[PDB]
Write a protein that binds this ligand. Structure first.
Ligand SMILES: [Cu+2]
Length: 9
């Protein structure tokens, strides 16, 4: 990241 921080989405 984003919305799923930390990722992979
Ligand atoms: Cu992320």
């Amino acid at each position: 990241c984003g919305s799923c921080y930390p990722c992979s989405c």
